[PDB]
Design an enzyme around this catalytic site. Structure first.
Site, mmCIF file in Angstrom:
data_model
loop_
_atom_site.group_PDB
_atom_site.id
_atom_site.type_symbol
_atom_site.label_atom_id
_atom_site.label_comp_id
_atom_site.label_asym_id
_atom_site.label_seq_id
_atom_site.Cartn_x
_atom_site.Cartn_y
_atom_site.Cartn_z
ATOM 1 C CB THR B 145 -0.932 0.005 1.211
ATOM 2 O OG1 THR B 145 -1.693 -1.209 1.237
ATOM 3 C CG2 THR B 145 -1.882 1.200 1.144
ATOM 4 C CD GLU B 183 10.306 -3.852 2.952
ATOM 5 O OE1 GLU B 183 10.338 -2.616 3.098
ATOM 6 O OE2 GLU B 183 10.380 -4.641 3.914
ATOM 7 C CD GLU B 254 10.083 30.477 2.478
ATOM 8 O OE1 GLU B 254 8.915 30.798 2.786
ATOM 9 O OE2 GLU B 254 11.091 30.883 3.098
HETATM 10 N N1 LIG Z 1 9.679 3.500 10.841
HETATM 11 C C1 LIG Z 1 8.597 2.702 10.657
HETATM 12 N N2 LIG Z 1 8.622 1.822 9.629
HETATM 13 C C2 LIG Z 1 7.580 0.997 9.394
HETATM 14 C C3 LIG Z 1 6.404 1.066 10.271
HETATM 15 N N3 LIG Z 1 5.531 0.150 9.810
HETATM 16 C C4 LIG Z 1 6.099 -0.450 8.730
HETATM 17 N N4 LIG Z 1 7.321 0.057 8.488
HETATM 18 C C5 LIG Z 1 8.242 -0.319 7.391
HETATM 19 O O1 LIG Z 1 7.501 -0.293 6.166
HETATM 20 C C6 LIG Z 1 7.799 -1.454 5.396
HETATM 21 C C7 LIG Z 1 6.540 -2.300 5.436
HETATM 22 O O2 LIG Z 1 5.511 -1.554 4.800
HETATM 23 P P1 LIG Z 1 4.091 -1.276 5.492
HETATM 24 O O3 LIG Z 1 3.900 0.218 5.566
HETATM 25 O O4 LIG Z 1 3.972 -2.111 6.741
HETATM 26 O O5 LIG Z 1 3.145 -1.902 4.348
HETATM 27 P P2 LIG Z 1 1.754 -1.252 3.881
HETATM 28 O O6 LIG Z 1 2.059 0.102 3.296
HETATM 29 O O7 LIG Z 1 0.761 -1.318 5.008
HETATM 30 O O8 LIG Z 1 1.329 -2.223 2.651
HETATM 31 P P3 LIG Z 1 0.663 -3.699 2.758
HETATM 32 O O9 LIG Z 1 0.684 -4.054 4.227
HETATM 33 O O10 LIG Z 1 1.569 -4.558 1.907
HETATM 34 O O11 LIG Z 1 -0.718 -3.513 2.185
HETATM 35 C C8 LIG Z 1 8.937 -2.170 6.098
HETATM 36 O O12 LIG Z 1 10.181 -1.731 5.545
HETATM 37 C C9 LIG Z 1 8.842 -1.705 7.533
HETATM 38 O O13 LIG Z 1 10.140 -1.656 8.125
HETATM 39 C C10 LIG Z 1 6.448 2.055 11.372
HETATM 40 O O14 LIG Z 1 5.489 2.179 12.163
HETATM 41 N N5 LIG Z 1 7.546 2.812 11.492
#
Ligand SMILES: Nc1nc2c(ncn2[C@@H]2O[C@H](COP(=O)(O)OP(=O)(O)OP(=O)(O)O)[C@@H](O)[C@H]2O)c(=O)[nH]1
Ligand SMILES: C=C/C=C\[C@H](C)[C@H](OC(=O)NCCCNC(=O)c1cccc(N=[N+]=[N-])c1)[C@@H](C)[C@H](O)[C@@H](C)C/C(C)=C\[C@H](C)[C@@H](O)[C@@H](C)/C=C\[C@@H](O)C[C@@H]1OC(=O)[C@H](C)[C@@H](O)[C@H]1C
Ligand SMILES: Nc1ncnc2c1ncn2[C@@H]1O[C@H](COP(=O)(O)OP(=O)(O)CP(=O)(O)O)[C@@H](O)[C@H]1O
Ligand SMILES: Nc1nc2c(ncn2[C@@H]2O[C@H](COP(=O)(O)OP(=O)(O)O)[C@@H](O)[C@H]2O)c(=O)[nH]1
Ligand SMILES: [Ca+2]
Ligand SMILES: [Ca+2]
Ligand SMILES: [Ca+2]
Ligand SMILES: [Mg+2]
Ligand SMILES: [Mg+2]
Ligand SMILES: [Mg+2]
EC number: 3.6.5.-
Lengths: 54, 434, 345, 428
Positions: B145, B183, B254
């Site tokens: 997503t 990823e 800006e």
């Molecule tokens: N810093 C941080 N990174 C996150 C967090 N949640 C997920 N990630 C990172 O984001 C990536 C995973 O993507 P998500 O955002 O969990 O996936 P999504 O966008 O929900 O997409 P789907 O679950 O595949 O539908 C990984 O590299 C994680 O390390 C968070 O709360 N903080």
């Protein structure tokens, strides 16, 4: 080492320090992309169902 | 006053957004029920904080935010959290099944079905604005997503809001905390499609935050909560000028003007100091400013000594006067390797907010008397693209995992098309900095 | 168990380092594209420094300092010395040099102004043109030679009064090997070599470049007296120190090595803030080859700095063991030093 | 509310399936009557993935029990947790399948499959968001192999966009029932290559050798082998049953684990494998759990991983331990044996931790590997198939049910193609 554009308010201030001078796709096109991908999904599924019907 | 709308996509975008709005409330004196006793203009106004908060007649201050995720569990934490009363249901959009870490699934398969609802909910926020500036978009690179739906949303926002600026806060994938192996695919697929639609993107590498949390906070195995509170501090430093009185970076335009002379090269490097453990039973202006040139404090690990600067912004919060800043910059010039490109002035734009950084009570971060966030547009950040592109090449040579994307209606040619665009981006950075 | 990769197959030095690591039984060599290495013996050109230090749970080390090319290129070395206050345009141990770009693409008018000053004042006016070589006393012949090429050149004052060994009346140069580790300790290998000419120095003919160019490859092919005085035109420090005692009533340490150590430390301390990996997410070490000339007044001149040097045939084993010991094992420990630590603070 | 529909078919499938539901019901605090008597909120947070809620806090497994003879399902219903399964979810015939794939797939099984699909449809229709299906069966018999792969084909036709997942017991001559098992397994494997997203390959020879060599069990029984499978099945599905970020659902697990559609057969593993007596109450350490998990002797496919390379690896640790030490030991297995992981899939080893350990253990670990060494398993089956098929031995059992030799020739060709596909990526 010139400080220019010094602006001050109650919450803080800002300025600039210069040390050295120098020397889209339309909505229609997006829909066709998404619908073309949907078409390819449906084609592949239809091929699978033809395979299972055989 | 001109409004800004925040959009939080996917798990990473939503949880970081939740941490940000918590911090904004503590910074502006907004209680969890939305009331703000220091706001004497009940029911409306055009103060600086109104850029991020609208006002009801009952005195509730409501974030100008939309939360989108393709599965409900993460946004359910918003619905039942501490600040549940800030938001109304029209601001939170959820689907049933997620994108499965698959860009093609978030962009084509699911994105097609939910995009009109998201735009409708954004239009409802936009219709509350007398002069909307644009959007701040929070997402991960690696999630299905965060990568796939976000790029579809950015394309559509350029159509529906052509004159509006769009800024990104993007989470760059790190295997230390990563969920998926694909990823690198999602990161490069989403960068290619979003590139011409983003005016300025702040990349945060989870590897850098993870190591700042181990080293400077003494947290052995940081959680997303640990990471998200430090990220929200950096985000707060970047957006503080939009929410408080000031004269630097006072509108989204800006940000592009001060940091992005080359439109494709729109990924500034953020560096933040000081990060002090609250469990620890005070640094000077010169010391926090010098720390801005240490790779260990950067949001993306890279070596700016071996690149060139195009722009540099210093954003201080706390007990800081201009005299001590200029003395610090002078000392740092005679010690550090700060090369600018020949077609840009060797200089710094400085912003000072006298209010020291707000810390979440019971959090991991100690209360400090002064902090700084440096936004520098340096060609060194291209190292992060090189790393990402190399992992892409290793898998794509065998077409590993490609069938998952083709199975969602994506064509193989979008992989190579996206990769060629990234190769050109790497060439653009090399021509500028070397 | 430590792992390493090899990405420069043409490296004489690190071919021996690789075999020594394997001989300890505690180092495993991987495929050249496997990213899960502790040690990279990298390629000479376009080493992917940007990909180092991002493998979780792996201390990573590389045998090159990113940015050291500034010291190890002809044109860059001249520019580094003229623009660095630590070195400065008045630097006493580097010959007067000028960067000259060919006209098909600069310090042309700066060089010609200094050349006219020497021609006017009856001073020796012989210069050398080299790049990535022509020795002449006429400026026109030096500039026309550079225009025929397409790369950047340097015009340098030719040392018309070199120290000549006897018998033979012959020119030489000194090579020093220096190892800088991940802590930026500077280690001078205690063994140097003198690449000597086997032809008598003839100041009345700069057209025959064999008594003028002390390169080992040049002597081995053009000099008809190759190997007459010493094996392979290589005189080592023990013999050279004995010669300076018998012939000039002095020692190698006093008359030459003091200046050599000073020059090595000046150059490397100058670039340390630009190349140090002290706080970086990966670590670097590097072996350098400094090249010196000695004039008849026993003044030492820096000529160039080599970033991927070869070693003397009889000194490979000792030097390559020292590289393993102070540069590699110091980071990845196993289960009377040959170097001289040049102290700095 | 991502629900999974579980199906167990045949003698092996129902006996392993029964023990599996016994093991996890204890983990989620569900007694044989379907009542919750646990003490932790983690037990109920994701319990809807495998259990439905009935009136009065009653939890009923979303499980479907299928057989062509009544015997084993009568034993399940008389077993300890037999009362917990939905009575209508018992679908059985009377004739049996006589260890004959054709009977399960084309004749006897064809008469029963529609009523099984009626129960599958009813369970799916009550799912807020169906993930997909989980089938436990053997490949050496007739019902689980023949009717099981018939069920997968018909489920895929009706639910083409749902994940299909199997725990498949591969036959071995060392632990054998009939000589025709290589025929049944070769016919079934081709079905699995086409119509499943993930298959856990459980080799009965490896289970036997583990019980004999490592566990010092002199005469292992099917009960001992099935408890070893149940423990392994409990560990691999921990990501699905408890709060977690890695492989949280079936589709993300498949995206992470399967780089090529046909190469989706996993080698599982379990730790600790401990002999009784003396050094039995010894506190386990993460280094010991990790070394056991990757030792060849502890893997249940009877394939030497040193004879191939891992494409992807998922390791799951259960218990209260140091996640820092888990990372260190996991990074120490790769960085020391990097010759056994492919280098063109970066970061292909993922690790998860769950705080709830299996009952009676301070900690444990399960290993899921997508290794090209699994071709050894398919090679063994292919060799045993060809030794008989070259003389057309025992074919009359199958031609009598309407099959002809050409179908056997194609199944043979398909599995030899699968072997060649694994060998291609082992040398990449
Ligand atoms: N810093 C941080 N990174 C996150 C967090 N949640 C997920 N990630 C990172 O984001 C990536 C995973 O993507 P998500 O955002 O969990 O996936 P999504 O966008 O929900 O997409 P789907 O679950 O595949 O539908 C990984 O590299 C994680 O390390 C968070 O709360 N903080
Ligand atoms: C033949 C070996 C039997 C047991 C060996 C020694 C291993 O068991 C242990 O290490 N148990 C811990 C030491 C004993 N502790 C306790 O009695 C105890 C009591 C109360 C609380 C407590 N801690 N807590 N909580 C521990 C066990 C983990 C084996 O290594 C493992 C191979 C056993 C399995 C999975 C199958 C064997 C082949 C079967 O024969 C089975 C019937 C035998 C014992 C099981 O009941 C075994 C079970 O099984 C599980 O499913 C699951 C992993 C866990 O419940 C497994 C204890
Ligand atoms: N300014 C100068 N005055 C006198 N002699 C010089 C000189 N510059 C170079 N030489 C002589 O010319 C040779 C040229 O080699 P130079 O130092 O220029 O680099 P190079 O790339 O040609 C080979 P090397 O790595 O062995 O130094 C020297 O070894 C020395 O013999
Ligand atoms: N591990 C295990 N294997 C079994 C069990 N029962 C049968 N098998 C194996 O399964 C195959 C026989 O299939 P079975 O399930 O009995 O036939 P079906 O009832 O027609 O599916 C043979 O390879 C047996 O070794 C069991 O309880 N546990
Ligand atoms: Ca107001
Ligand atoms: Ca635009
Ligand atoms: Ca019948
Ligand atoms: Mg998600
Ligand atoms: Mg050279
Ligand atoms: Mg049976």
């Amino acid at each position: 080492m010139e400080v220019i554009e010094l602006n001050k308010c109650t919450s803080g201030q800002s300025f600039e320090v210069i040390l050295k001078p120098p020397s889209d796709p339309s909505l229609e096109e997006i829909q066709k992309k998404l619908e073309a991908a949907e078409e390819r999904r449906k084609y592949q599924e239809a091929e699978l169902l033809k395979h299972l019907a055989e | 006053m001109r409004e800004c709308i925040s959009i939080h996509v996917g798990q990473a975008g939503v949880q970081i957004g939740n941490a940000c709005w918590e911090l904004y409330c503590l910074e502006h004196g907004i209680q969890p029920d939305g009331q703000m006793p220091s706001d004497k203009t009940i029911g409306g106004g055009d103060d600086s904080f109104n850029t991020f908060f609208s006002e009801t007649g009952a005195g509730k201050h409501v974030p100008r935010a939309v939360f989108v995720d393709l599965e409900p569990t993460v946004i359910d934490e918003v619905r039942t959290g501490t600040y549940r009363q800030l938001f109304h249901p029209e601001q939170l959009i959820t689907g049933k099944e997620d994108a499965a870490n698959n860009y093609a699934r978030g962009h084509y398969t699911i994105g097609k079905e939910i995009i009109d609802l998201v735009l409708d909910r954004i239009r409802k926020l936009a219709d509350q604005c007398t002069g909307l500036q644009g959007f701040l978009v929070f997402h991960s690179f690696g999630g299905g997503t965060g990568s796939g739906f976000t790029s579809l949303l950015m394309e559509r926002l350029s159509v529906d809001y052509g004159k509006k600026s769009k800024l990104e806060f993007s989470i760059y994938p790190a295997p230390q905390v990563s969920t998926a192996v694909v990823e690198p695919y999602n990161s490069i697929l989403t960068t290619h499609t979003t590139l011409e639609h983003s005016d300025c993107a702040f990349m945060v590498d989870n590897e850098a935050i993870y190591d700042i949390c181990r080293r400077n906070l003494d947290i052995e195995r940081p959680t997303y909560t640990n990471l998200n509170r430090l990220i929200s501090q950096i985000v707060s430093s970047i957006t503080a000028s939009l929410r408080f009185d000031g004269a630097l970076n006072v509108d989204l335009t800006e940000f592009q003007t001060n940091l992005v002379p080359y439109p494709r090269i729109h990924f500034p490097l953020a560096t933040y100091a000081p990060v002090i453990s609250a469990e620890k039973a005070q640094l000077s202006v010169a010391e926090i400013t010098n720390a801005c040139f240490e790779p260990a404090n950067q949001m993306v690990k890279c070596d700016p000594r071996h690149g060139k600067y195009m722009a540099c912004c210093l954003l201080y919060r706390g007990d800081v006067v201009p005299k001590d800043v200029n003395a610090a910059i002078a000392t740092i010039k005679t010690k550090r390797s700060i090369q600018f490109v020949d077609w840009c002035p060797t200089g710094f734009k400085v912003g000072i907010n006298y209010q020291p950084p707000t810390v979440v009570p019971g959090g991991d971060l100690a209360k400090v008397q002064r902090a700084v966030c440096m936004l520098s547009n340096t060609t060194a950040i291209a190292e992060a693209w090189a790393r990402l592109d190399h992992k892409f090449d290793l898998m794509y040579a065998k077409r590993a995992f490609v069938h998952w994307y083709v199975g969602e209606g994506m064509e193989e040619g979008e992989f190579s098309e996206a990769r060629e665009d990234m190769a050109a981006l790497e060439k653009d950075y090399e021509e500028v900095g070397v | 168990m430590y792992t390493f990769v090899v990405r420069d197959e043409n490296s004489s030095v690190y071919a021996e380092v690789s075999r020594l690591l394997l001989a300890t039984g505690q180092w495993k060599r991987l495929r050249k594209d496997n990213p899960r290495f502790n040690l990279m013996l990298g390629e000479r050109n376009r080493l992917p420094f940007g990909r180092l230090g991002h493998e979780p749970g792996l201390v990573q080390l590389v045998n090159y300092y990113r940015g050291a090319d500034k010291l190890c290129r002809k044109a860059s070395l001249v520019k580094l010395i003229k623009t660095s206050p630590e070195l400065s345009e008045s630097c006493t141990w580097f010959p007067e040099s000028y960067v000259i770009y060919p006209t098909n693409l600069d310090e042309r008018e700066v060089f010609l102004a200094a050349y006219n000053r020497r021609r006017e004042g009856r001073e020796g006016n012989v210069w050398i043109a080299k790049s990535s070589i022509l020795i002449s006393s006429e400026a026109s012949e030096l500039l026309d030679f550079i225009d025929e090429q397409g790369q950047v050149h340097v015009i340098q004052k030719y040392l018309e009064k070199p120290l000549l060994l006897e018998p033979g009346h012959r020119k030489f140069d000194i090579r020093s090997w220096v190892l800088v580790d991940h802590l930026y300790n500077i280690y001078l290998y205690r063994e140097g070599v003198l690449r000597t000419s086997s032809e008598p120095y003839n100041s009345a003919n700069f057209q025959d470049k064999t008594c003028h160019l002390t390169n080992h490859c040049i002597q081995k092919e053009y000099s008809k007296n190759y190997g007459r005085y010493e094996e392979g035109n290589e005189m080592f420090f023990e013999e050279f120190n004995q010669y300076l005692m018998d012939a000039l009533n002095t020692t190698l340490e006093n008359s030459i090595l003091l200046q050599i150590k000073h020059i090595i430390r000046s150059c490397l301390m100058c670039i340390e803030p630009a190349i140090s990996t002290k706080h970086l997410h990966y670590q670097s070490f590097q072996l350098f080859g400094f090249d010196f000339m000695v004039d008849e007044e026993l003044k030492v001149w820096l000529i160039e700095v080599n970033g991927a040097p070869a070693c003397a045939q009889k000194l490979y084993a000792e030097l390559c063991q020292g590289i393993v010991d102070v540069a590699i094992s110091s980071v990845f420990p196993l289960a009377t030093s040959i170097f001289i630590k040049l102290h700095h603070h | 509310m991502r629900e999974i529909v579980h199906i167990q078919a045949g003698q092996c499938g129902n006996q392993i399936g029964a023990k599996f539901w016994e093991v996890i019901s204890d983990e989620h605090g569900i007694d044989p009557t379907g009542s919750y008597h646990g003490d932790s909120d983690l037990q109920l947070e994701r319990i809807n993935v495998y259990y439905n809620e009935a009136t009065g806090n009653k939890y009923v497994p979303r499980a479907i029990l299928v057989d062509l003879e009544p015997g084993t399902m009568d034993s399940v219903r008389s077993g300890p947790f037999g009362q917990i399964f939905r009575p209508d979810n018992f679908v059985f015939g009377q004739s049996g399948a006589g260890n004959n794939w054709a009977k399960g797939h084309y004749t006897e099984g064809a008469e029963l499959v529609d009523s099984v699909l009626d129960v599958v449809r009813k369970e799916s229709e009550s799912c807020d968001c169906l993930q997909g299906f989980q089938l436990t069966h053997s490949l050496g018999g007739g019902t689980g192999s023949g009717m099981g792969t018939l069920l997968i084909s018909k489920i895929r036709e009706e639910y083409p966009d749902r994940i299909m997942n199997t725990f498949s017991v591969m036959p071995s001559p060392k632990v054998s029932d009939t000589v025709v098992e290589p025929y049944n397994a070769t016919l079934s494997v081709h079905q699995l290559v086409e119509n499943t997203d993930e298959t856990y390959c459980i080799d009965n020879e490896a289970l036997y050798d583990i019980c004999f060599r490592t566990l010092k069990l002199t005469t292992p029984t099917y009960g001992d082998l099935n408890h070893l499978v149940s423990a392994t099945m409990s560990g691999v599905t921990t990501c699905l049953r408890f709060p977690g970020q890695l492989n949280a659902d079936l589709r993300k697990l498949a995206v992470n684990m399967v780089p090529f559609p046909r190469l989706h057969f996993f080698m599982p593993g379990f730790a600790p494998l401990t002999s009784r007596g003396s050094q039995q109450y010894r506190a386990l350490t993460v280094p010991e759990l990790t070394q056991q998990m990757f030792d060849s002797k502890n893997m249940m496919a009877a394939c030497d991983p040193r004879h191939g390379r891992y494409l992807t690896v998922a390791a799951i640790f259960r218990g209260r331990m140091s996640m820092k030490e888990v990372d260190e030991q996991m990074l120490n297995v790769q960085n020391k044996n990097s010759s056994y992981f492919v280098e063109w899939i970066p970061n292909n080893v993922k690790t998860a931790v769950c705080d709830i350990p299996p009952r009676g253990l301070k900690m444990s670990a399960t290993f899921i590997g997508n290794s090209t060494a699994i071709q050894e398993l398919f090679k063994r089956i292919s060799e045993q198939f060809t030794a008989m098929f070259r003389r057309k031995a025992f074919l009359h059992w199958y031609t009598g049910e309407g099959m002809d030799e050409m179908e056997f020739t194609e199944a043979e060709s398909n599995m030899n193609d699968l072997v060649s596909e694994y060998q291609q990526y082992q040398d990449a």
